[PDB]
Amino acid sequence: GSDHVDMRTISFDIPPQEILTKDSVTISVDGVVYYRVQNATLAVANITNADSATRLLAQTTLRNVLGTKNLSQILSDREEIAHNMQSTLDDATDAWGIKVERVEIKDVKLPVQ
């Protein structure tokens, strides 16, 4: 019956977003996110707004998780930001017929060079 087009592999890239840490220092962190959408139809049909939400929600979640820590913590502990970021996104996207797979980040800019 159905077995055409790969609508299970959905990966998104997040550009270096600047956020404030516990040290009140701005840091630009970048990473990639991998997820699988089950509601490709409704998903792709409303992706025009879904994409923005994913980027906005991802930026806010990552900004908070990392913003609540030090530069040496968010840069050394990407798992915390990745888990927290996927924690909300997974539940926030789950209801939208989307299941997260794995989020990997790596590209944080240090304040004082």
Method: NMR
Cβ within 8 Å of residue 104, ≥6 positions away: 31, 32, 33, 34, 78, 82
CA separation for the pair 52, 93 (Å, rounded): 12
CA distances from 30 to 13, 14, 72, 93 (A): 8, 6, 16, 21
- β-partners of residue 53 are none
Q: What is the DSSP string of 39-65?
A: -HHHHHHSHHHHHHHHHHHHHHHHHHH
Cβ within 8 Å of residue 73, ≥6 positions away: 21, 22, 80
Q: Looking at beta carbons, which pairs linking 89-93 to residues 24 or more positions away fall under 8 Å?
A: 89/33, 89/35, 89/54, 89/57, 89/58, 89/61, 92/53, 92/57, 93/35, 93/54
101 near 82, Cβ under 8 Å? no
* Biggest CA-to-CA distance, the chain: 58
Residue 19's closest CA among 89, 103, 111? 111
CA separation for the pair 98, 50 (Å, rounded): 11
CA separation for the pair 99, 92 (Å, rounded): 10
